[PDB]
Nucleic acid binder design. Structure first.
Ligand SMILES: [K+]
Ligand SMILES: [K+]
Ligand SMILES: [Mg+2]
Ligand SMILES: [Mg+2]
Ligand SMILES: [Mg+2]
Ligand SMILES: [Mg+2]
Ligand SMILES: [Mg+2]
Ligand SMILES: [Mg+2]
Ligand SMILES: [Mg+2]
Ligand SMILES: [Mg+2]
Ligand code: NA
Ligand code: NA
Ligand code: NA
Ligand code: NA
Ligand code: NA
Ligand code: NA
Ligand code: NA
Lengths: 38, 120, 196, 144, 325, 63, 66, 123
RNA sequence: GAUGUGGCCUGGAGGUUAGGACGAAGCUUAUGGCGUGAGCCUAAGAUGGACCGGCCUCUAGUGCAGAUCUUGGUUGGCGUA
RNA sequence: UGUUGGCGAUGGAAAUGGGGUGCCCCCACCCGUCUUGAAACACGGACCAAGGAGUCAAACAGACGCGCAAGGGAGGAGAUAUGCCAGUACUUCUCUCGUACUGAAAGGGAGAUGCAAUGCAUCUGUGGUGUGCACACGUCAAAUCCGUUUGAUUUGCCCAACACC
């Protein structure tokens, strides 16, 4: 079950990184939109 | 010397166990739990195999091919709840657990219905 | 309606599956398709592509050519590293013009009886592709080789023999019949042996 | 097999791959190699240069048995020696003997590098072959 | 090198043990078997043709145009119903067939000696895998072993009753019964042409010479073979490999001298050795699942509005600043 | 298109086939948000979030 | 019974396009040029080949020794 | 036994493709033959003529081959044929062959009733 | 005009699996079901009376609407000239 | 994704699909042919059954399948299992295509490197240069579950192949 455990641990590590990347991209888009409007 | 992959390549297209009627391909094999013509369920050529069969009365008999007495056709198959049947099969072949479970349930239901129509 | 004129002239003709009837060839293709799909190496992709080809496009190779190219690679290689494994998707034939060869490991689809005997006598090993998949699953430290195609009689016949600059053989069963007119200047003319 | 032919694929198509305009007729260009000088001249001249004419002297009663003369090369000489004698061979001592006319050859030619010294019995030999074998360490003996 | 038991003809007891010949480990090439069978089955054929004068024994001529009939040759004369009728044509009644058949059609075929030997070897190797025998169609459920080797004392039998008792003891009677029950009258025109009955194929019994066949000759559904001349048309009926063969011990020990091994040459077929295999181990799933391959396999990875304007969810997903405007 | 000389001399030669003019910010925004598709692996894919744009262009100036 | 036209010929020629010319560095033969310069060029090429063989031998010896 | 549920069957076209002008000649069969006349109106695709079969008339693969009862037909010839159907109960129904006699039909019908296997033409 | 098709169909051969006097082949159809189609399959016969189906290979005198096509039967004109 | 009615209580029922015949609104020139052009005042065309047209042999070539490979393979014939068996099993010698070409012919007849100018010496070897799979050694980007991938390029050897010698 070592392979399965490694797989599930890696997936649990990847989901949070995807969420963090989404969160960062949202802020970057907000800032750029504001400056373009100005 | 001659492996299961080679044998499957040799018999996939014509065999006495392959029934191609209409456009449907079934299997006549007595050691097949499904009827599908695939290498997983072709139990007559695999090294290890297990099949669930109906027995006298309400008994359920499981026939197991251990894989050590192949090349001795008279000693190839030695006989032996649905969870118990599945655990019995999974010792020989783990990938034959779900189908054997469902087959045991279906055999029990067939026996019950036969007893019903016998009483009627 | 969309204007897509001359869009079928971009289509390419590839093979994608084998016409061979050999079950062992089919087993090898089954192994190396999986390897090429699940591995990042280019060796596996090339080998898979060459297993699908036809017999005429897998030309045989020679023991003398193998020995020569291996030596030319070896002269510039560190003295502590090991020699590679020669791999050919095809047949390996013998050469009576070279008597003594080094000890090499060769992998091929087929060996002549004489080629096998020569290799083992010199002190090497003849491998199969299923053994190679277990020694070098990615193809590290290998020498991929191809056999020669030109010099075939069909290739030397391709073309028109009677146009200037052309040196292809004609289709004729009598060797003394087609000489003279169009081949000698004493007759009407002679076709020119060179053209820019 | 008749079931693999093109005529089985063409049942129902009237013209069988020959067209409605120019039909399929008996002999639309002549019979055989007719017209090699008039209306098939481009074909003849571009694919078969040299078909027409004469060249050379004649030879009224040719017999090939007196003209028999096959050839073999120095780098090919090892096909005529057995493996054990080839291993036992070495320049300076006792060498194997090869009989060309018994093996089916008449002349010895001198292409390549000789892979084993030996004594060769031949009906004919060339200058380079003789010189090369003498340098290698063997010899050539004329026979009849 | 594996070993094979030898069974007694009168009981369920093993008598000796013999090593397995190399021909049974030789490679199996069903494509070669099918090719050689297709071309070898053509050599026992006879010629047929029509007469060279048939359909053309009249003095017919065309009537031309001007008379309002089609331009086909017509039979001459008067006084019979055949006068003025069409002649000389595949389209006419009583006419000549299109392209009459000749007797110099190619009836027979040539096969390379090495390819014939290869096919025989492959069929022999396939006749030792018990699943291929079952797929071909034999009933071998209660058979002691495959290959089945039997003592050499059955060559002294003199009565078919003794022969049948031996067959029942060895348990070939199931396949013999299959053959017996299959017999019938053939469908189609063939039963008018000396081909009236059909039946299945049973077991084949191989003997070291041509002696001792008197008791077995009449048993329906059993075929007899000589080890010195083995026939591919019998080792692979229909072009399918996997016949059921019963070996006598002496023939079993002669197999190695007849066919040679992977290194030593045959003493009978001059300069013939068993073909080398293309794969050393033919199990590619084990290689695919091994640890050496799995260490290098690539790691696995983790895996509706459309308007964009006037859909607030999509608009705010694309442009998070629309709130502050 | 860019409205320079090499492109103006191309637009002048196919005039009976086209209509053109100078767009505004509203027009550009509407045509990107409503009817904008990308070329991803040679396929036509509709724009649905900013992650596709970032992955396609791989340039810190286009995210 | 004799007619001539150039109507469909441009379209036929452009179906598989007009192929461009071969690059000038390919098929750059010198046959038929000025013989006095041709001979001197041949001599220089021979010397160059000898030099290349010597250079490779030197490289091999250096790699082997060190 | 009840079949597995599926989507609704659509059947793009119900009418058959019959040959051109077979209604005027008794000897012409109604089966489809492709018209290859140079002036043929059916081949030239005029407005009021009949249609020719295409690949676009093909049926949805999710429901192809399914009969109105919800099963698919598998032909059987004797009693032992039902044992290979006993496991795929809700997918396939058996069709007794035309030439099986009454004596065997009785046994087949009884066994199928015991095993709970649907017969398309049972009794 | 070219090519492809675990694309359809007909007579025979090597294999394999099956059916039939409790009714084979053939024939009839407001007998439905399946397939884009060539076609396949079931039903009924208040038809028939002895043979024959599926699958894998092999083989050929292997698919008809028209040729002033060939042979046999029929037909309007017509109870007319 | 649930909710409310109608019909349906085992019938000669209800319902939904097929099939048949009539009707209404709309659409719609007669097939095969040759021809630049046919619905043609251009030819063939009363109905049905059965028959009816790219085939066999032989020489050569290209593509694809199979066996062996500097060799491949007979044919004719023989010998004994063999006396069901026109098949299958076995075979010395030879013959043929190929490994070498060129000249009208008499005839002649192809390795590399170094040193010299029918010369001499060595023999584990691409005759040289340009463009060139894979493999090996470095370096840099992008992405990343941080383990590696996907790319680029430098150098070594360059297999097949093409260009110039
Ligand atoms: K003209
Ligand atoms: K339909
Ligand atoms: Mg050559
Ligand atoms: Mg003269
Ligand atoms: Mg008898
Ligand atoms: Mg027409
Ligand atoms: Mg016939
Ligand atoms: Mg009707
Ligand atoms: Mg015919
Ligand atoms: Mg030559
Ligand atoms: Na023509
Ligand atoms: Na014309
Ligand atoms: Na006749
Ligand atoms: Na037209
Ligand atoms: Na007809
Ligand atoms: Na015509
Ligand atoms: Na017309």
């Amino acid at each position: 079950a070592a392979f399965k455990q490694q797989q599930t641990e890696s997936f649990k590590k990847a989901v949070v990184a995807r969420k963090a990347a989404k969160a960062a991209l949202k802020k970057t888009a907000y800032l750029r939109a504001r400056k373009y409007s100005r | 010397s001659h492996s299961v992959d080679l044998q499957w390549v040799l018999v996939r297209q014509n065999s006495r166990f392959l029934q191609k009627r209409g456009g449907i391909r079934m299997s006549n094999d007595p050691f097949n739990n499904n009827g599908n013509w695939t290498k997983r369920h072709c139990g007559f050529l695999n090294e290890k195999a297990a099949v669930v069969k109906p027995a006298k009365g309400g008994a359920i008999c499981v026939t197991v091919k251990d894989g050590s007495s192949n090349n001795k056709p008279r000693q190839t198959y030695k006989k032996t709840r649905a969870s118990d049947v599945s655990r019995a099969v999974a010792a020989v072949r783990p990938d034959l657990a779900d189908v054997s479970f469902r087959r045991a349930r279906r055999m029990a239901c067939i026996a019950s219905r036969t007893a019903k129509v016998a009483a009627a | 309606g969309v204007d897509l004129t001359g869009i079928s002239k971009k289509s390419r003709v590839i093979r994608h599956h084998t016409y061979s009837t050999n079950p062992y060839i089919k087993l090898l293709i089954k192994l190396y398709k999986f390897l090429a799909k699940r591995t990042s190496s280019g060796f596996n992709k090339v080998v898979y592509q060459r297993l699908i080809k036809s017999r005429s496009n897998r030309a045989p190779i020679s023991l003398s050519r193998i020995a020569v190219v291996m030596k030319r690679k070896a002269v510039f290689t560190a003295k502590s590293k090991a020699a590679p494994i020669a791999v050919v998707v095809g047949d390996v034939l013998d050469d009576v013009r070279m008597a003594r060869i080094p000890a090499m490991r060769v992998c091929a689809l087929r060996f002549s009886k004489s080629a096998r005997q020569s290799i083992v006598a010199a002190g090497g090993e003849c491998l199969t592709f299923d053994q190679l998949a277990m020694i070098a699953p990615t193809g590290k430290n290998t020498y991929l080789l191809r056999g020669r195609k030109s010099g075939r009689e069909s290739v030397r016949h391709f073309g028109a023999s009677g146009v200037p600059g052309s040196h292809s053989k004609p289709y004729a069963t009598n060797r003394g019949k087609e000489t003279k007119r169009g081949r000698r200047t004493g007759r009407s003319y002679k076709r020119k042996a060179f053209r820019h | 097999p008749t079931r693999f032919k093109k005529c089985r694929h063409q049942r129902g198509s009237t013209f069988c791959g020959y067209g409605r305009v120019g039909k399929h007729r008996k002999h639309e260009s002549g019979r055989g190699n007719a017209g090699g000088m008039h209306h098939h001249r481009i074909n003849f001249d571009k694919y078969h240069p040299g078909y027409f004419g004469k060249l050379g002297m004649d030879h009224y009663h040719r017999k090939k048995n007196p003209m028999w003369k096959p050839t073999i090369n120095l780098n090919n000489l090892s096909r005529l020696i057995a493996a054990e004698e080839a291993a036992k061979a070495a320049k300076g001592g006792t060498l194997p003997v090869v009989d060309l006319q018994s093996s089916g050859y008449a002349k010895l030619l001198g292409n390549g590098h000789i892979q084993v010294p030996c004594i060769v019995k031949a009906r004919y030999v060339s200058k380079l072959a003789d010189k090369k074998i003498r340098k290698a360490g063997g010899a050539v003996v004329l026979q009849a | 090198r594996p070993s094979v038991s030898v069974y007694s003809a009168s009981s369920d007891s093993v008598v000796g043990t013999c090593p397995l010949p190399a021909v049974f480990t030789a490679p199996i090439r069903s494509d070669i078997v099918k090719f050689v069978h297709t071309n070898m089955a053509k050599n026992s054929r006879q010629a047929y043709a029509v007469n060279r004068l048939s359909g053309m024994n009249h003095s017919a001529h065309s009537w031309g145009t001007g008379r309002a009939v089609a331009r086909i040759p017509r039979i001459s004369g008067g006084g019979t119903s055949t006068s003025g009728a069409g002649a000389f044509g595949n389209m006419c009644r009583g006419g000549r067939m299109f392209a009459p058949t000749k007797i110099f059609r190619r009836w027979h075929r040539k096969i390379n000696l090495h390819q014939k030997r290869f096919a025989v070897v492959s069929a022999l190797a396939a006749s030792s895998v018990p699943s291929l025998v079952m797929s071909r169609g034999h009933q071998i459920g209660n058979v002691p072993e495959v290959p089945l080797v039997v003592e050499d004392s059955i060559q002294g039998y003199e009565k078919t009753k003794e022969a049948m008792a031996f067959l029942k003891a060895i348990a070939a009677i199931d396949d013999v019964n299959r053959v017996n029950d299959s017999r019938e009258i053939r469908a189609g025109r063939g039963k008018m042409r000396n081909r009236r009955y059909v039946a299945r194929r049973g077991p084949m019994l191989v003997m070291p010479n041509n002696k001792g066949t008197r008791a077995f000759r009449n048993i329906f559904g059993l075929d007899l073979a000589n080890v010195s001349a083995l026939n591919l048309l019998h080792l692979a009926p229909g072009g399918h490999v996997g016949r059921f063969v019963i070996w006598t011990q002496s023939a079993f020990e002669q197999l190695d001298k007849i066919f040679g091994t992977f290194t030593e040459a045959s003493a009978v077929k001059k300069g013939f050795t068993l073909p080398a295999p293309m794969l050393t181990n033919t199990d590619v799933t084990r290689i695919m699942q091994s640890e050496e391959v799995r260490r290098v396999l690539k790691p696995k990875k983790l895996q509706t509005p459309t308007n964009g304007m006037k859909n607030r969810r999509l608009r705010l997903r694309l442009n998070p600043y629309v709130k502050r405007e | 298109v860019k409205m320079n000389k090499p492109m103006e001399n191309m637009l002048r030669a196919v005039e009976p086939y086209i209509a053109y003019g100078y767009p505004s910010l509203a027009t550009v925004r509407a045509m990107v948000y409503k009817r904008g598709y990308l070329k991803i692996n040679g396929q036509r894919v509709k724009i649905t979030d900013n992650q596709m744009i970032k992955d396609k262009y791989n340039n810190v100036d286009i995210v | 019974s004799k007619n001539h036209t150039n109507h469909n010929q441009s379209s036929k020629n452009h179906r598989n396009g007009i192929k461009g010319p071969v690059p000038l560095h390919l098929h750059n033969s010198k046959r038929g040029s000025w013989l006095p310069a041709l001979v001197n060029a041949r001599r220089v090429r021979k010397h160059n080949q000898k030099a290349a063989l010597k250079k490779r031998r030197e490289r091999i010896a250096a790699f082997a020794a060190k | 036994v009840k079949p597995t549920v599926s989507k609704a069957i659509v059947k793009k076209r119900t009418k058959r493709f019959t040959r051109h002008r077979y209604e005027l000649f008794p000897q012409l069969s109604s089966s489809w033959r492709k018209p290859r006349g140079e002036d043929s109106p059916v081949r030239r695709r005029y407005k009021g003529q009949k249609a020719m079969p295409n690949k676009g008339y093909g049926s949805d693969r999710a429901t192809k081959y399914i009969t109105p009862s919800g099963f698919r037909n598998f032909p059987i010839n004797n009693v032992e044929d039902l044992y290979m159907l006993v496991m795929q109960n809700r997918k396939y129904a058996g069709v007794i062959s035309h030439t099986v006699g009454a004596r065997k039909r009785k046994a087949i019908v009884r066994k199928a009733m015991e095993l709970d296997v649907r017969l398309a033409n049972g009794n």
